[PDB]
Symmetry: D2
Subunit: 94 residues, 4 copies
């Protein structure tokens, strides 16, 4: 009875261990799978933000081009205002 109980226990522990290591291997593999998917959703969010980064770099360059164009328009209007001021003052002298 004693050695029968001890042999029965040893087989139970042997079965428990194999079931333990198999679950421990499944845990380590699912932690790998769920972490990878997280890593691209990390990296994809990074690359989509970097795309936006360089779009606003382009937007700032285009704002500077627009600013030069309006500055040239203003210089033409200053010239025109000068010429029209001379004509106004001439009419005032008549």
């Amino acid at each position: 009875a004693l050695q029968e109980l001890r042999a029965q226990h040893e087989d139970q522990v042997e079965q428990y261990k194999k079931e333990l290591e198999k679950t421990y291997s499944a845990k380590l593999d699912n932690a790998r799978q769920s972490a990878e998917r997280n890593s691209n959703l990390v990296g994809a969010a990074h690359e989509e933000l970097q795309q936006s980064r360089i779009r606003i770099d382009s937007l700032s360059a285009q704002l500077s081009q627009l600013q030069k164009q309006l500055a040239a328009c203003e210089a033409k209007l200053r010239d025109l205002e000068d010429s029209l001021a001379r004509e106004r003052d001439t009419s005032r002298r008549l």
Copy 2:
């Protein structure tokens, strides 16, 4: 003699017509002067208003450029939190591969 009375009357006709012409000319000249004065003042007022509005627009574009720079700064810090996140998830990946 007799032609002398036609001379005198021609002269008198001429002086009446010169006076009439002087009045007609002065009225026409003052109307064209007024019309030219009003058009000159309006063209100067218009070009000044247009010019002023453009100076306003340039101030607005200067502000927009400054705000784009702050937006750059804001999106830089967002990239930092994303890189550290990349980093620690990669730390967990490396440690998991080594079991």
Copy 3:
């Protein structure tokens, strides 16, 4: 009699001076006409160039607005990847609290 020769000579003096004045007036008038023509053509050319440049600037601002919208779309998708990341890290947090 004798005054008649002063009359005739006065008339002759007057006709010479009227002819001189006609020439002087025609030259002055043509110069002021040319000056006014050139200034009018230049003012029209200037305001047309200014106006055209402003139409160019409006096209540029229409483009900038369109690009801001695409930037909105790009940053929306970035928020999606950040929310799902939020979501799965929260999934791991909840599961860890339950041990």
Copy 4:
């Protein structure tokens, strides 16, 4: 000798188990700590992106205001161009 070996083994397994559960509790706690820090770096990146979101909403509103202002400038220039065209044509008629 037999029962001495079996008692010695039982004490070893008892000591191994307590050392196992203590390490298993330390593992579960560090996974909690490292995941939290990851979660704010997630959420802080989210809130800083949302801040940028509403800045560009403001930028688009300001672009529309600027567009109206330039459209009003253009209408003044059209008026001025009309008036100057009439003066040009008048000078051409002289």
